Amino acid sequence: YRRIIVPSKEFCTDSGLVVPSISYELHKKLLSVAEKHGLTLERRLEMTGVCASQMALTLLGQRPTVALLCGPHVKGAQGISCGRHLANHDVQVILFLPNFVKMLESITNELSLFSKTQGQQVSSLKDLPTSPVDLVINCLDCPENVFLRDQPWYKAAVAWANQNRAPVLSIDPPVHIDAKWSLALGLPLPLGEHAGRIYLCDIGIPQQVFQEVGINYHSPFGCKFVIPLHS
Amino acid sequence: YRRIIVPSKEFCTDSGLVVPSISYELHKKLLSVAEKHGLTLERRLEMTGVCASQMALTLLGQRPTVALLCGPHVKGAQGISCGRHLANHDVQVILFLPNFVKMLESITNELSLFSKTQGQQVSSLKDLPTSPVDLVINCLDCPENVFLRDQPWYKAAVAWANQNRAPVLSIDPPVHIDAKWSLALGLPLPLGEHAGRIYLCDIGIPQQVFQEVGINYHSPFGCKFVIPLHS
């Protein structure tokens, strides 16, 4: 039944527990409270990295190949963290990331860690394998970067993901490339049918943090860190 | 065969890959290099937390009960992080931690995060369940705290773990309480038969960090973050 209560969409787990959707703002505010209460950005990034990589690995089954399409924003950095963890586990990670002017700390740190792996970083779409890869991970869009959707590298990246034939995993995709699987973090946004097979990841938000932002929360995860969700 | 080469004991995986042991100093120096190369303490603590909790959960199978025996050192903090993650997943976590004078940052932060969960923190052994719990997790000992072994709370804690009947998981135990399972981190120390069923956890050390401390490394994990090891 309904264990989580929010003050829009409604998903359920394999056990039929109802996990509701939350607005983008409520999601950001929840993340802002956690960070004040200890769970830093680089702590979330590390965990998201691990858990996302663990899901990606399950989806994977010579070494498999994963294409990583990240943007110059905090959603992109999540993908990098994920990419790094996969590269650790003998997966051929090739990460696409466009160059930028004003440096982004989250990206800075995650790239630096990525450097030390055998994963490959590219700033071109033409440096990616012509032959379909095993999995494409998409972290191209941050909802606060409204105008970045019109970019030539953006439309060209979108074009690449769609021509490769490889199935797409979208980590923390926007509400509004067809993803085969989409991964939500902590709590889902009201994700549409465009999102495909929807999963929810645990980012280690303590139960009392939810109650502070007015959410009666009871963990829908059981004993898994990534769970499938249904409509 | 032998993929990892070190410049003592030798374990092998289910696939028969040989993973060798490393000295405590080499282990600390490896951790010291990673931290310089980006992977901070709180990043390792977060990941160790997740992966250790994931193992503990596998060992677990009304809500199950886990007793958490942590010391006032960085090994203790690992246990707290683990405890916090379990408490997130509807496990009854009761954490034993003795009071101390000079405050320990790692513990400070992890306790603060633990606070926000429904997990219970105690400084007494008499506050723990009289009826055997489902699992006891032991992080009582840091090898640099030589003299802390003689402590009255130490000998009394050791006494508690042994009288409960519950199986013991020792996360990052010393080389020299009988653990049913012991978990090593990144690379194992030459752990003796006293350690019991030995597993190796991934703490997200990039391949190039190993080569800097003179270790030709190839990931023994395959696609798991915790693996069993054999002699």
Using alpha carbons, list the distances in angstroms from residue A64 to A92, A123, A137, A178, B3.
6, 21, 13, 21, 19
Enclosing domain of residue B162? 1-231
Closest residue in A to B36 (Cα) is A113
Cβ distance of A209 and B116 shorter than 8 Å: yes
Q: Which amino acid is at B8?
A: S
Is residue A47 exposed (0-12), middle (13-18) or buried (19+ Cβ within 10 Å)? buried
Instruction: Tell me how close the Cα of A86 comes to any Cα of chain B, in angstroms.
Output: 9
CATH number, position B156: 3.40.50.10260
Locate tokens 């943007």: which residue? A71
The tokens describing A126, both together, are 């033409």
Burial A109-132 (b: 16+ CB within 10 A, else e): bbbebbebbebbbeeebeebeeee
Query: Residue B96 contacts by C-beta under 8 Å, 6 or more apart in sequence?
Result: B67, B68, B69, B70, B122, B123, B124, B125, B127, B128, B157, B160
The tokens describing A77, both together, are 């950095």
Which among A88, A113, A225 has the least Cβ separation from residue B38? A113
Query: Residue B199 contacts by C-beta under 8 Å, 6 or more apart in sequence?
Result: B55, B181, B182, B183, B184, B226, B227, B228, B229
Answer for the pair B96, B70: CB distance below 8 angstroms, yes or no: yes
Answer for the pair B167, B189: CB distance below 8 angstroms, yes or no: no
This entry's atomic model was obtained through X-ray
Q: Does B35 touch chain A (CB under 8 A)?
A: no
Answer for the pair A53, A43: CB distance below 8 angstroms, yes or no: no
Answer for the pair A215, A6: CB distance below 8 angstroms, yes or no: yes
Beta bridge partners of B200: B184, B227
Q: Does A33 touch chain B (CB under 8 A)?
A: no
CA dihedral A9, A13, A16, A20 (to 10 degrees): -30
Cβ distance of B116 and A223 shorter than 8 Å: no
Beta bridge partners of A18: A2, A12
Cβ distance of B46 and A204 shorter than 8 Å: yes
Cβ distance of B219 and A109 shorter than 8 Å: no
The tokens describing A14, both together, are 């394999």
Give the span between the Cα atoms of A78 and A49, in whole angstroms.
6
The tokens describing A73, both together, are 């924003």
DSSP at B208: H
Nearest to A17 by CA among A209, A200, A214: A200
3-state secondary structure of B167: coil
Resolution, angstroms, 1 dp: 2.8
Answer for the pair A68, A83: CB distance below 8 angstroms, yes or no: yes
Pairing relationship of beta strands B92-96 and B65-70 according to DSSP bridges:
parallel
Residue B14: other Cβ atoms inside 10 A: 11
Which among B57, B88, B112 has the least Cβ separation from residue A38? B112
Report the residue of A42, A43, A55, A134 to disrupt the B interface, i.e. the one with the largest count of B CBs within 10 Å: A43
Which among A89, A208, A209 has the least Cβ separation from residue B219? A89
Instruction: Tell me how close the Cα of B104 comes to any Cα of chain A, in angstroms.
Output: 15
Residues after which a C–N gap over 2.5 Å breaks chain B: 7, 61, 176
Where helices occur in chain A by DSSP H, the ranges are 24-36, 41-60, 74-88, 105-115, 152-163, 207-212
Domain count, chain B: 1
Q: What is the CA radius of gyration of chain A?
A: 17
**Sheet arrangement for strand A168-171:** A120-122, A92-96, A65-70, A135-139, A168-171, A181-185, A197-201, A226-228
Q: Does A204 touch chain B (CB under 8 A)?
A: yes
Nearest to A134 by CA among A62, A81, A193, A223: A62
Give the span between the Cα atoms of A163 and A212, in whole angstroms.
45
Q: How many CB pairs under 8 A join A and B?
A: 109
Beta bridge partners of B172: none
Nearest to B114 by CA among B93, B137, B135: B93
Q: Which amino acid is at A126?
A: K
3-state helix, strand, coil in chain B (%, to 5): 35, 20, 45
Answer for the pair B195, B85: CB distance below 8 angstroms, yes or no: no
DSSP at B225: S
Put residue B194 in one of left, alpha, beta given phi > 0 → left and psi -120 to 50 → alpha.
Answer: alpha
A42 contacts in chain B (CB < 8 Å): 40, 42-43
Answer for the pair B201, B18: CB distance below 8 angstroms, yes or no: no
Is residue A227 exposed (0-12), middle (13-18) or buried (19+ Cβ within 10 Å)? buried
